[PDB]
């Protein structure tokens, strides 16, 4: 619904990386993988975390 706080598998915090990831795509124009590696998410477990999140709360917030 939100970025999960950690990688389910290794525990690395990853919930402090969502705004940055999305800034790193739209503002500085990197491809999704270069971006993830810049935030230091280098095992495929953590990468899967950000790369496959879906921010559904951004839809939930349109209701009144």
């Amino acid at each position: 619904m939100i970025v999960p706080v950690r990688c389910f598998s290794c525990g690395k915090v990853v919930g402090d990386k969502w705004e940055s990831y999305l800034n790193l795509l739209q503002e500085d124009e990197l491809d999704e993988g270069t971006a993830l590696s810049r935030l230091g998410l280098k095992r495929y477990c953590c990468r899967r975390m950000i790369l496959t999140h879906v921010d559904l709360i951004e839809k939930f917030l349109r209701y009144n």
């Binding site: 839809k59 349109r62 209701y63 009144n64």
Partner: protein
Amino acid sequence: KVFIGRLPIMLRSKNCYLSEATESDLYKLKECPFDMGGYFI
């Protein structure tokens, strides 16, 4: 004029409110913008 009845109306048919609505309008109305219609209540 002269009433003869009640017709259950299919969601997102031309007759139902949702078919003209925009995305904002669907959120104000509490209807998920991904619902697709085609059934009755």
